[PDB]
């Protein structure tokens, strides 16, 4: 379903999820899992609201969402913390830092990775419109197959457009494109270490069963 | 340290290239895979050192980088080595594997499928040799003195943007193709991770030679 890149960015602007509005050992585990669940509900809705997503296979829709909920959640946290150095804005109410993450053993390294990546995004001077395309691509590339390639190339065109609209040379444009794209490897990296810890906490019972993200964690 | 033109970098990468390696069961075939990996790794360290600016990096960094991507750089090599042979994986000339012989090892066939699917995705984009070299090098430099690395990466990025330009296409089709191969690298890393997960649940006998080679990096050579 063909449309202009400017239009795709606007529908992605609208599709955006509402802001979820919410120290000891287990208290922060259930606060984070509470937020992750509430946010996941919004993600599925957000994902469905992406043009062409619901036209995709039932298998594909699930396999995609399954393989990136963690990353899309982290990318969201990265944008929330972009203009707050040394802080991770999980929710506008519940804000945490490096010296706050020391509560649980093993959870320190992930907060460091997230902050380091947020920093790299801050240095990059990442725009809102640039970010939206990035999040959608994170979801569509975390893998009908041809319909997906089309939907991805659409958000790729939508990102190439936002990068052109900033007003810079063909070299500085392409360089900036590749910059954020290679910075996504670092988001996925942090997402994997988070999944290895999340699945380990499920197999430790420090985090509750609760809802939805329990359904996500299994498959 | 360098203000070397992108064409000259693409050339250094071409000169730096390792010699291809030439070395039916389920474990001695898996032993063949680990034997091939260990010897190709020797060439990789050499190749890595031969990249401009790499040896100027922290020796700790040099090892950390090589540690986090030997598997991926090896797999990227296999996909270039398989680009023009649909349905097969040219590991070595004397070791060609395909869909018909991965079922023998526990969850190895899954990796083969991923590897073939990605190779397919690379032939559909008609990936050039010069495009591949920049990609391989970036895989290594981005798998993470830190400032020197960002410079070296931006250099290979410029070297890739240049080969993308030299093919002669519109500014939209240029940027679209850049992002295409860059997003296809996520799929290479994905397959790499699956492979590392397998290797980690295997006996230590297998990871030891990798680590011994990586710590052999204490020069001269
Ligand atoms: C601290 C955290 O990064 C939290 N996350 C996991 C519980 C879902 S989370 O996915 O990073 C996350 C990110 C943003 C949010 O608004 C909500 C959650 C983490 C990672 C691994 C293991 C435990 C917690
Ligand atoms: C099937 C395979 O993908 C083989 N690999 C290494 C263990 C040998 S490998 O890393 O994928 C590989 C890649 C390129 C080569 O030229 C040779 C090997 C694998 C990966 C991890 C664990 C076990 C086997």
Swiss-Prot record, chain A:
**Record text about domains:** Composed of three domains: a modulating N-terminal domain, a DNA-binding domain and a C-terminal ligand-binding domain.
> Which disease does its entry mention?
Ovarian dysgenesis 8: An autosomal dominant form of ovarian dysgenesis, a disorder characterized by lack of spontaneous pubertal development, primary amenorrhea, uterine hypoplasia, and hypergonadotropic hypogonadism as a result of streak gonads.
Question: Superkingdom of this entry's organism?
Answer: Eukaryota
Portion of the full-length sequence here:
261 to 497 of 530
Name recorded for this polypeptide: Estrogen receptor beta
Question: So what does this one do?
Answer: Nuclear hormone receptor. Binds estrogens with an affinity similar to that of ESR1/ER-alpha, and activates expression of reporter genes containing estrogen response elements (ERE) in an estrogen-dependent manner.
Instruction: Describe the protein's quaternary organization and the partners it interacts with.
Output: Binds DNA as a homodimer. Can form a heterodimer with ESR1. Interacts with NCOA1, NCOA3, NCOA5 and NCOA6 coactivators, leading to a strong increase of transcription of target genes. Interacts with UBE1C. Interacts with AKAP13. Interacts with DNTTIP2. Interacts with isoform 4 of TXNRD1. Interacts with CCDC62 in the presence of estradiol/E2; this interaction seems to enhance the transcription of target genes, including cyclin-D1/CCND1 AP-1 promoter. Interacts with DNAAF4. Interacts with PRMT2. Interacts with CCAR2 (via N-terminus) in a ligand-independent manner.
* Outcome following mutation: residue 148 to R: Found in a patient with a 46,XY disorder of sex development; uncertain significance; shows a higher positive regulation of DNA-binding transcription factor activity
Where's it found, cell-wise?
Answer: Nucleus
**Family assignment from sequence similarity:** Belongs to the nuclear hormone receptor family. NR3 subfamily.
Q: Which gene encodes it?
A: ESR2
Query: What positions does the domain NR LBD occupy?
Result: 4-219
């Amino acid at each position: 379903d063909a449309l202009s890149p400017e239009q795709l960015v606007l529908t992605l602007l609208e599709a955006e999820p509402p802001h979820v509005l919410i120290f000891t050992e287990a208290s922060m585990m259930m606060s984070l899992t509470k937020l992750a669940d509430k946010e996941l509900v919004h993600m599925i809705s957000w994902a469905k609201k992406i043009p062409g997503f619901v036209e995709l296979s039932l298998f594909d829709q699930v396999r995609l969402l399954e393989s990136c909920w963690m990353e899309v959640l982290m990318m969201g946290l990265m944008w929330r913390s972009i203009d707050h150095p040394g802080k991770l804005i999980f929710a506008p109410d519940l804000v945490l830092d490096r010296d706050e993450g020391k509560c649980v053993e093993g959870i320190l390294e992930i907060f460091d990775m997230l902050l380091a990546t947020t920093s790299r995004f801050r240095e990059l001077k990442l725009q809102h419109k640039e970010y939206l395309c990035v999040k959608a691509m994170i979801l569509l590339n975390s893998s009908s197959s041809r319909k997906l390639a089309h939907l991805l190339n659409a958000v790729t065109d939508a990102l190439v457009w936002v990068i052109a609209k900033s007003g810079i040379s063909s070299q500085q444009q392409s360089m900036r494109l590749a910059n954020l794209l290679m910075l996504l490897s670092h988001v996925r990296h942090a997402s994997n270490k988070g999944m290895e810890h999340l699945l380990n906490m499920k197999c430790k019972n420090v985090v509750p069963v609760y809802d939805l993200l329990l359904e996500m964690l299994n498959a």
